[PDB]
Amino acid sequence: KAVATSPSGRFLKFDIELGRGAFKTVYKGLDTETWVEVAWCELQDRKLTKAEQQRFKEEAEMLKGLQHPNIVRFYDSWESILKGKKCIVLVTELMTSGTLKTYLKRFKVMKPKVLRSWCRQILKGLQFLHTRTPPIIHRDLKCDNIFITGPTGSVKIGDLGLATLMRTSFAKSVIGTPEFMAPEMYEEHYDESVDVYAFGMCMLEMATSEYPYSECQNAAQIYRKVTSGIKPASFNKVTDPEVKEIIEGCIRQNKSERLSIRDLLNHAFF
């Protein structure tokens, strides 16, 4: 049976590892109110500074009050202080139907009706985030972080609890994916147009089934291309001219000339 219980007593932890990476370990959890499996994520405190743990504690207090049909649910989070553990626990919605990357690695061409429906649902999720008070930036948008839901084949972007943990020094240097970062995202301050940039790289990955900036071998080569206006090589492999036009407007180096979520949703293609 269960080996741990959330402080609220709602979620139970089972000693069943569902996944493990360089950053977190995911265990099988159980929601005692709805009787569905959840993701019991654990992050060791040695990978987070004291300031990052404190900042996440305050951000998570408001993120667990956010829900959207196109966003993976972030349920709860707390600090597990015990001998041999000393970690931060995150309880999120358990996605088992794979990601967009999972099915882009197995199929060559995506139907234009499917690319239109999925990109629109992603834009709807970002629109809901950017229009909150205060605005919320996802900061971790990529096809490897967009999950399929069983019914109707809807898509959900990764939960905000794990997405905000990608800002930490450990995540940016160990599990970072700089090929989805806007040129101004490398700086100390940026805004919500960063999500528009990452969305353009997501559509580029759907339209080509190829990883953006795959010709580069290190993050330094990716930084020099992006900060010099050099588009990735797979950008020219887009067959649809209208799709290629939307992608360019999302990955423009100058964020003032870059498209907005409003312009994308009002575009004739979406």
From Swiss-Prot:
Sequence ranges assigned to domain Protein kinase in this UniProt record: 12-270
Annotated compartments: Cytoplasm
Tissue localization of expression: Expressed in brain, lung, kidney, liver and pancreas, and in fetal tissues including placenta, fetal brain, lung and kidney. Very low levels of expression were also detected in fetal heart, thymus, liver and spleen. Isoform 1 is brain-specific. Isoform 3 is kidney-specific.
Binding site for ATP: T92, E93, L94, M95, K142
Positions of the catalytic residues: D159 (proton acceptor)
Modification after translation: Autophosphorylated at Ser-169 and Ser-173, promoting its activity. Ubiquitinated by the BCR(KLHL2) complex, leading to its degradation. Ubiquitinated by the BCR(KLHL3) complex, leading to its degradation.
Residues found modified as Phosphoserine: S169, S173
Effect after changing D159A: Catalytically inactive form. Inhibits sodium-coupled chloride cotransporters and activates potassium-coupled chloride cotransporters
Similarity field: Belongs to the protein kinase superfamily. Ser/Thr protein kinase family. WNK subfamily.
Stated role: Serine/threonine-protein kinase component of the WNK3-SPAK/OSR1 kinase cascade, which plays an important role in the regulation of electrolyte homeostasis and regulatory volume increase in response to hyperosmotic stress. WNK3 mediates regulatory volume increase in response to hyperosmotic stress by acting as a molecular crowding sensor, which senses cell shrinkage and mediates formation of a membraneless compartment by undergoing liquid-liquid phase separation.
UniProt disease link: Prieto syndrome: An X-linked recessive disorder characterized by impaired intellectual development, developmental delay, autism spectrum disorder, variable epilepsy, craniofacial dysmorphism, and structural brain abnormalities including polymicrogyria and cerebral atrophy.
Domain comment in the entry: Disordered regions undergo liquid-liquid phase separation (LLPS) for the formation of a cytoplasmic membraneless compartment that concentrates WNK1 with its substrates, OXSR1/OSR1 and STK39/SPAK.
Assembly and interaction partners: Interacts with WNK1 and WNK4.
Official protein name in the record: Serine/threonine-protein kinase WNK3
